[PDB]
Structure formats: C-alpha cells, structure tokens
Amino acid sequence: PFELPALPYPYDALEPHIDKETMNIHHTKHHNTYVTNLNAALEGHPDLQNKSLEELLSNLEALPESIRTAVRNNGGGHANHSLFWTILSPNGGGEPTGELADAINKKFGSFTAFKDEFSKAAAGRFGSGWAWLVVNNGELEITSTPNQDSPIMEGKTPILGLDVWEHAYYLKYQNRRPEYIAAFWNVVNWDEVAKRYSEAKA
Amino acid sequence: PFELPALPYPYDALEPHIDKETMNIHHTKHHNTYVTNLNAALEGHPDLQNKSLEELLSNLEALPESIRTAVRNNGGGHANHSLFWTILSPNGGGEPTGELADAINKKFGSFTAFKDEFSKAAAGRFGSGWAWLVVNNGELEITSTPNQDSPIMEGKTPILGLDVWEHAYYLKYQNRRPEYIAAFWNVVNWDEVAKRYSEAKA
Numbered sequence A, B: 001p002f003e004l005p006a007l008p009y010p011y012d013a014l015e016p017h018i019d020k021e022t023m024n025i026h027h028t029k030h031h032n033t034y035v036t037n038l039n040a041a042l043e044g045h046p047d048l049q050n051k052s053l054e055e056l057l058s059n060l061e062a063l064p065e066s067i068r069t070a071v072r073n074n075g076g077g078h079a080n081h082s083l084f085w086t087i088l089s090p091n092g093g094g095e096p097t098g099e100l101a102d103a104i105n106k107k108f109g110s111f112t113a114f115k116d117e118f119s120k121a122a123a124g125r126f127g128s129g130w131a132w133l134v135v136n137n138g139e140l141e142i143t144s145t146p147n148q149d150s151p152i153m154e155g156k157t158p159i160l161g162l163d164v165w166e167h168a169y170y171l172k173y174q175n176r177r178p179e180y181i182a183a184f185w186n187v188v189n190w191d192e193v194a195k196r197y198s199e200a201k202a
C-alpha cells in the first residue's frame, strides 16, 4: 500500500524560510492523514491496490462512485505533498540551468518573468489550492488547482508546486501569503525540477 | 461604502475556546482585507454603491463581468464574518430555547442530533469553507459552502455559521479541526441565532 515518504532533510533544514514546527506538522499529520485515508479507501478493492497514484488519478472516471471523491482528495493530497518535499532543499535557491532554464526562457522570456507569473498565480488562488509549473505534452505552463486536485487528473505532469493551503504558512506568516511565496524561492531544489523536467519530456 | 464592524466584546472574551491572537488577526487583517477589496471592486461603479450586500450576492449575474468574482469572494467574506462575530459570545454556550429550540427538536430530533450533523458538516468540508444552519422557505437545514460563498447566493438565509478556513483555528488547534468544532459550541450566542431565526421566518 501507500506509505508516507521520509524527508531527505531535517525538519529545521529550511529555516528561516519555513519553520520547523510547520514542517513537522505538515508532514507527520497533514500528509500522513492523506496516506492513511487513501489506503482506507482502497481496502475493499484489490482491483486497485496494485496501481500507481498516477494511474488512479488518470482514471478517476472508472473508480466506483463510493471512493472516487476519497481517492481524488486523499490521492491528490499524497501525490502533491510527495512532490513538494523533493523540490525543497536547504542547499536550494538560485536559478535553473541547462535545458530547463532554456525552456523557461523561451516560454516566459526570462527567469524573472517566470517567478512573477508563478508568484502571481500562487497569490491569486482563492481559498485552498496549489500553484504549479507543469509539462503539458512537451510544453511548460503555469497553472493552479483547488484543494488537493492534482494536475495529473488533467493529463499534465507537475515538476514544481507550491502549497498555498493556509496550514503551509500560517504559523509563521499568518495572512501574509505573499512573503511566504517570496521565501519559497530561496529553497527551491532546481536540480530536482530539472530531473523531473528531463523525465516528463519523454 | 462598506466598513469593518466593531466586535461587541474584547478579543480576550472567548478564551479558552478561541484564542485572542486568532480573534485579533481574523478581524483586523482577514475580514478587513475582504472589506477593502469589496470597496475597491465597486469603485467606478456608482450604480452599485448604494446596494445592500444581500442585493449584491443575490444578483451576481447582473454585475459586470470584470468584478463579479471580486464581489462574490470579498462580498461573501464580508457577509460571512459579519454574521460570525454576532453569533459568538462570552456569555454563550448551552442550548437553544423556545421557538428555536422546538424547531431544532422537530427537524433534527434533538439538540444533540443537530449538533452531531452540524459538526460532521463542518468536519466534512474539504478545503476552505463554512458550515451553516440556514432557513430555506421557513424550514431549517444544515449545509456547507466552499471558500467565501454565502448561502444568500442560493436564496437561503443563514442564521448560524461556523468558519472552517484553517486561519480560523490553526494557531491554537493546528490540524485538529474537530477539537475546534467541539469548542465552538461553548461560545454560541443562541439568543442572536434566535433573533435571526425569528426574522428569517418573515
């Protein structure tokens, strides 16, 4: 079944940009709740217990109506937060390089303009949701989704996401989401984003 | 123009059920932001500037296309928090009385049963939103809405509401929303809910 992934860094590694208390609660309680509920939803269906998260979220239409919403919300929660951890790093920040930077420069004109568009999208998502950079049939684009909806449901491959649920920033930033977004850029693991872009292109 | 209402009690008054810090921030920053953004969307539209919040939210389609969303979200936020403050009280708690008590026993069986299904409605609202006791053509019903949507848009009159945006409970309760839902019952101003129920029946 599905398992809570271990973090690749200590819970305080992202200070002062994300507080360790938030990292611990976000991971051990928010994320792990999504995993347990996801597993609970599929307990009665050996049909589905051997399918990847990507397969389930691409075939939401086919799942029984009794669990469709559970898989949507808890499967999305698991998929989104699993990606989130990997694209953070205490050694992150800076700018992308190589093929990825070249792709960003062509679609958005500059890395600066990409940051602005991504920050605007993250600030504009009313209520709970996520802001994404995705690969959509070989092309980069910025989008945002509500609640725990994953772009995989729309046939898009996420390579970078920013959780803008209030639980991701309230303890430290309270209502000041924009400076949580500003702080986010100092811990982005661009090497991981590039790896995911290299893989999504295929 | 619309203005941020004064609270009829100190920020200290609902302890230990709701922390003063949250009350202060919820009022002067979250709610205030909704009011200012509502007034800003209406600037340049003097035809809309003497219409009540109820009239605005009931005919969102009549509003121009470019401000419709701003009014739904910030108008809804203003209407919802305005009601929220009035149904909290340091002298609250207990059970309803009289007309409202009979209407609740009749429709839900008993105050305990109504509490149970109102608590589950509040807990089951995924993401941001509100739990409501509304009057719908003279009849009581429990419902919930996403984000800052107000049941006034559907033609229902809210007489009691519970804010379940994470900012409403995260500083004190973090992920434990049910703990916050349970504490909410100790500060409910049932007298206010009664006056509202009395007036919606007209």
Ligand SMILES: [Mn+2]
Pocket (backbone or CB within 6 Å): A026, A030, A081, A163, A165, A167, A168
């Ligand atoms: Mn989250």
Ligand SMILES: [Mn+2]
Pocket (backbone or CB within 6 Å): B026, B030, B081, B163, B165, B167, B168
């Ligand atoms: Mn609120």
